[PDB]
Protein backbone atom coordinates (compact mmCIF):
# COMPACT_ATOMS: atom_id res chain seq x y z
CA UNK A 1 0.00 0.00 0.00
CA UNK A 2 1.27 3.48 -1.04
CA UNK A 3 0.13 5.29 2.06
CA UNK A 4 1.45 2.66 4.40
CA UNK A 5 4.71 2.84 2.53
CA UNK A 6 4.94 6.59 2.88
CA UNK A 7 4.31 6.31 6.60
CA UNK A 8 7.02 3.65 6.78
CA UNK A 9 9.37 5.93 4.91
CA UNK A 10 8.93 8.70 7.45
CA UNK A 11 9.54 6.29 10.33
CA UNK A 12 12.78 5.18 8.77
CA UNK A 13 13.78 8.78 8.26
CA UNK A 14 13.09 9.72 11.84
CA UNK A 15 15.14 6.88 13.23
CA UNK A 16 17.88 7.36 10.66
CA UNK A 17 18.24 10.99 11.78
CA UNK A 18 18.16 9.92 15.43
CA UNK A 19 21.22 7.71 15.20
CA UNK A 20 22.91 9.93 12.62
CA UNK A 21 26.05 10.44 14.67
CA UNK A 22 27.88 11.66 11.56
CA UNK A 23 26.85 14.71 9.53
CA UNK A 24 27.33 12.78 6.29
CA UNK A 25 24.62 10.38 7.38
CA UNK A 26 22.19 13.21 7.87
CA UNK A 27 22.94 14.51 4.38
CA UNK A 28 22.21 11.13 2.83
CA UNK A 29 19.04 10.65 4.80
CA UNK A 30 17.73 14.07 3.81
CA UNK A 31 18.49 13.35 0.16
CA UNK A 32 16.53 10.14 0.37
CA UNK A 33 13.61 11.92 2.03
CA UNK A 34 13.45 14.44 -0.82
CA UNK A 35 13.36 11.67 -3.38
CA UNK A 36 10.63 9.87 -1.48
CA UNK A 37 8.57 13.01 -1.13
CA UNK A 38 8.60 13.59 -4.86
CA UNK A 39 7.78 9.96 -5.63
CA UNK A 40 4.88 10.08 -3.22
CA UNK A 41 3.32 13.17 -4.74
CA UNK A 42 3.58 11.78 -8.26
CA UNK A 43 2.31 8.30 -7.30
CA UNK A 44 5.52 6.55 -8.38
CA UNK A 45 5.32 3.37 -6.36
CA UNK A 46 8.55 1.84 -7.57
CA UNK A 47 10.63 4.88 -6.78
CA UNK A 48 9.10 5.22 -3.34
CA UNK A 49 9.76 1.55 -2.60
CA UNK A 50 13.36 1.93 -3.69
CA UNK A 51 13.99 4.75 -1.26
CA UNK A 52 12.47 2.76 1.55
CA UNK A 53 14.75 -0.18 0.78
CA UNK A 54 17.75 2.15 0.82
CA UNK A 55 16.67 3.64 4.13
CA UNK A 56 16.28 0.23 5.68
CA UNK A 57 19.81 -0.78 4.74
CA UNK A 58 21.09 2.54 6.05
CA UNK A 59 19.32 2.20 9.36
CA UNK A 60 20.28 -1.43 9.86
CA UNK A 61 23.91 -0.49 9.46
CA UNK A 62 23.58 2.30 12.02
CA UNK A 63 21.80 0.10 14.54
CA UNK A 64 24.13 -2.95 14.19
Amino acid sequence: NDDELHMLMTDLVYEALHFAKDEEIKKRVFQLFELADKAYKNNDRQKLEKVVEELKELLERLLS
Binding site: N1, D2, D3, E4, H6, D11, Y14, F30, F33, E34
Partner: protein, 194 residues
Protein backbone atom coordinates in the same frame (compact mmCIF):
# COMPACT_ATOMS: atom_id res chain seq x y z
CA UNK B 1 -23.84 18.89 36.59
CA UNK B 2 -22.04 16.09 34.65
CA UNK B 3 -18.58 16.53 33.05
CA UNK B 4 -18.51 17.05 29.25
CA UNK B 5 -16.77 13.81 28.41
CA UNK B 6 -19.25 13.46 25.58
CA UNK B 7 -17.60 16.52 24.01
CA UNK B 8 -14.21 14.81 24.14
CA UNK B 9 -14.70 11.12 23.49
CA UNK B 10 -17.69 11.56 21.09
CA UNK B 11 -16.27 14.68 19.32
CA UNK B 12 -17.15 14.99 15.64
CA UNK B 13 -13.57 15.77 14.80
CA UNK B 14 -10.30 15.22 16.59
CA UNK B 15 -7.33 17.51 16.28
CA UNK B 16 -4.19 16.57 14.45
CA UNK B 17 -1.34 15.43 16.65
CA UNK B 18 0.91 18.38 15.87
CA UNK B 19 -1.76 20.72 17.28
CA UNK B 20 -3.63 18.69 19.88
CA UNK B 21 -6.74 20.12 21.47
CA UNK B 22 -6.73 20.69 25.22
CA UNK B 23 -10.19 20.66 26.77
CA UNK B 24 -10.30 21.82 30.37
CA UNK B 25 -12.72 20.01 32.66
CA UNK B 26 -13.75 21.51 36.02
CA UNK B 27 -16.70 22.13 38.38
CA UNK B 28 -18.55 18.90 37.44
CA UNK B 29 -19.14 15.22 38.25
CA UNK B 30 -16.69 12.92 36.52
CA UNK B 31 -17.92 9.38 36.09
CA UNK B 32 -14.98 7.26 35.05
CA UNK B 33 -16.72 3.89 35.14
CA UNK B 34 -18.19 4.44 31.72
CA UNK B 35 -14.75 5.06 30.28
CA UNK B 36 -13.03 2.13 31.95
CA UNK B 37 -15.73 -0.44 31.22
CA UNK B 38 -16.70 0.84 27.76
CA UNK B 39 -14.94 -2.17 26.24
CA UNK B 40 -14.47 -0.11 23.07
CA UNK B 41 -11.02 1.03 24.06
CA UNK B 42 -7.91 -0.88 23.10
CA UNK B 43 -5.63 1.14 25.31
CA UNK B 44 -6.25 2.33 28.84
CA UNK B 45 -3.00 3.02 30.64
CA UNK B 46 -2.85 5.04 33.88
CA UNK B 47 0.19 6.51 35.52
CA UNK B 48 0.26 7.54 39.15
CA UNK B 49 -3.26 6.21 39.58
CA UNK B 50 -5.11 2.90 39.33
CA UNK B 51 -7.98 2.90 36.72
CA UNK B 52 -10.42 1.30 39.13
CA UNK B 53 -9.83 3.86 41.84
CA UNK B 54 -10.53 6.93 39.73
CA UNK B 55 -14.04 7.41 41.09
CA UNK B 56 -12.67 7.67 44.61
CA UNK B 57 -10.40 10.60 43.85
CA UNK B 58 -11.07 14.33 43.51
CA UNK B 59 -9.06 16.64 41.32
CA UNK B 60 -8.18 20.29 41.03
CA UNK B 61 -8.41 19.97 37.27
CA UNK B 62 -8.76 17.42 34.53
CA UNK B 63 -7.34 18.16 31.11
CA UNK B 64 -8.37 16.12 28.14
CA UNK B 65 -5.79 16.36 25.39
CA UNK B 66 -7.32 14.89 22.27
CA UNK B 67 -5.69 13.94 18.97
CA UNK B 68 -5.34 11.36 16.19
CA UNK B 69 -2.23 9.25 15.71
CA UNK B 70 -1.22 6.08 13.95
CA UNK B 71 -1.58 2.67 15.63
CA UNK B 72 2.14 1.96 15.95
CA UNK B 73 2.63 5.37 17.60
CA UNK B 74 0.22 4.70 20.45
CA UNK B 75 3.10 3.27 22.47
CA UNK B 76 4.77 6.69 22.41
CA UNK B 77 1.99 8.33 24.36
CA UNK B 78 3.54 7.58 27.70
CA UNK B 79 6.00 9.17 30.15
CA UNK B 80 9.64 8.39 29.47
CA UNK B 81 9.07 7.50 25.81
CA UNK B 82 10.83 8.80 22.70
CA UNK B 83 10.06 8.84 18.98
CA UNK B 84 8.74 11.35 16.48
CA UNK B 85 5.48 11.80 18.35
CA UNK B 86 6.90 11.77 21.83
CA UNK B 87 9.67 14.18 20.82
CA UNK B 88 8.08 16.58 18.29
CA UNK B 89 4.29 16.43 18.65
CA UNK B 90 3.08 15.45 22.11
CA UNK B 91 5.46 15.16 25.01
CA UNK B 92 4.39 13.75 28.35
CA UNK B 93 6.60 14.50 31.38
CA UNK B 94 8.39 11.68 33.18
CA UNK B 95 6.29 12.38 36.29
CA UNK B 96 3.03 12.44 34.33
CA UNK B 97 -0.09 11.65 36.30
CA UNK B 98 -3.17 10.71 34.35
CA UNK B 99 -4.70 8.13 31.98
CA UNK B 100 -4.09 7.52 28.29
CA UNK B 101 -7.10 6.19 26.46
CA UNK B 102 -7.15 5.15 22.83
CA UNK B 103 -9.32 3.31 20.37
CA UNK B 104 -9.42 2.17 16.78
CA UNK B 105 -11.30 4.80 14.83
CA UNK B 106 -10.88 3.36 11.34
CA UNK B 107 -14.59 3.57 10.63
CA UNK B 108 -14.66 7.27 11.48
CA UNK B 109 -11.42 8.87 10.32
CA UNK B 110 -10.73 6.88 7.16
CA UNK B 111 -12.36 7.57 3.80
CA UNK B 112 -12.35 5.23 0.81
CA UNK B 113 -9.85 7.37 -1.10
CA UNK B 114 -7.81 8.14 2.03
CA UNK B 115 -8.16 10.76 4.75
CA UNK B 116 -5.24 13.20 4.49
CA UNK B 117 -6.44 15.86 6.91
CA UNK B 118 -4.37 14.62 9.82
CA UNK B 119 -0.93 16.16 10.17
CA UNK B 120 2.11 15.45 12.28
CA UNK B 121 5.46 17.13 12.71
CA UNK B 122 8.44 15.26 11.33
CA UNK B 123 11.08 17.94 11.47
CA UNK B 124 11.97 20.17 14.40
CA UNK B 125 15.15 21.90 15.57
CA UNK B 126 14.83 20.43 19.08
CA UNK B 127 12.61 18.31 21.32
CA UNK B 128 9.39 19.62 22.89
CA UNK B 129 8.91 20.62 26.47
CA UNK B 130 6.14 18.65 28.26
CA UNK B 131 2.72 19.69 26.97
CA UNK B 132 4.17 22.19 24.49
CA UNK B 133 2.11 22.90 21.35
CA UNK B 134 4.35 23.81 18.46
CA UNK B 135 2.05 24.77 15.63
CA UNK B 136 4.52 26.84 13.65
CA UNK B 137 4.78 26.14 9.94
CA UNK B 138 8.21 27.72 9.48
CA UNK B 139 10.31 25.82 6.97
CA UNK B 140 12.73 23.46 8.65
CA UNK B 141 16.36 24.33 8.22
CA UNK B 142 18.21 21.11 7.47
CA UNK B 143 21.24 22.53 5.69
CA UNK B 144 23.67 25.31 6.57
CA UNK B 145 22.27 27.70 3.96
CA UNK B 146 19.17 29.70 5.17
CA UNK B 147 15.84 28.52 3.65
CA UNK B 148 14.25 31.98 3.88
CA UNK B 149 10.74 30.49 3.99
CA UNK B 150 10.98 28.50 0.76
CA UNK B 151 10.92 24.71 0.33
CA UNK B 152 13.73 23.06 -1.61
CA UNK B 153 17.19 21.58 -1.15
CA UNK B 154 17.61 20.84 2.56
CA UNK B 155 14.44 22.93 3.32
CA UNK B 156 11.24 21.22 4.35
CA UNK B 157 7.71 21.94 5.32
CA UNK B 158 7.83 20.40 8.82
CA UNK B 159 4.40 18.76 8.71
CA UNK B 160 3.56 15.47 7.04
CA UNK B 161 0.15 13.91 6.51
CA UNK B 162 -1.18 10.51 7.53
CA UNK B 163 -2.63 8.63 4.57
CA UNK B 164 -5.36 6.84 6.45
CA UNK B 165 -7.17 4.50 4.04
CA UNK B 166 -9.58 1.71 5.16
CA UNK B 167 -7.49 -1.11 3.75
CA UNK B 168 -4.48 -0.48 5.98
CA UNK B 169 -3.03 -3.11 8.32
CA UNK B 170 -3.31 -2.71 12.08
CA UNK B 171 -0.18 -0.63 12.65
CA UNK B 172 -1.37 1.84 10.05
CA UNK B 173 -4.87 2.31 11.44
CA UNK B 174 -5.88 5.65 12.95
CA UNK B 175 -6.44 5.81 16.66
CA UNK B 176 -8.25 8.43 18.61
CA UNK B 177 -6.33 9.31 21.70
CA UNK B 178 -7.52 11.13 24.75
CA UNK B 179 -5.10 11.86 27.53
CA UNK B 180 -6.61 12.83 30.85
CA UNK B 181 -4.06 14.74 32.88
CA UNK B 182 -4.86 15.04 36.55
CA UNK B 183 -3.97 17.85 38.93
CA UNK B 184 -4.09 16.75 42.58
CA UNK B 185 -2.57 19.86 44.15
CA UNK B 186 -4.03 21.51 47.22
CA UNK B 187 -7.21 23.06 45.88
CA UNK B 188 -11.03 23.35 46.14
CA UNK B 189 -10.96 20.10 44.10
CA UNK B 190 -13.79 21.14 41.83
CA UNK B 191 -14.11 18.07 39.60
CA UNK B 192 -14.61 14.50 40.85
CA UNK B 193 -16.45 11.22 41.00
CA UNK B 194 -20.22 10.81 41.78
Amino acid sequence: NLCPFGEVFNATRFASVYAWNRKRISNCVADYSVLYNSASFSTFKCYGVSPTKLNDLCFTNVYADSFVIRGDEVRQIAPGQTGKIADYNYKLPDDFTGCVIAWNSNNLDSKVGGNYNYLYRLFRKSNLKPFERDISTEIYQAGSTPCNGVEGFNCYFPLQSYGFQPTNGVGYQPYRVVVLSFELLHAPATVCGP
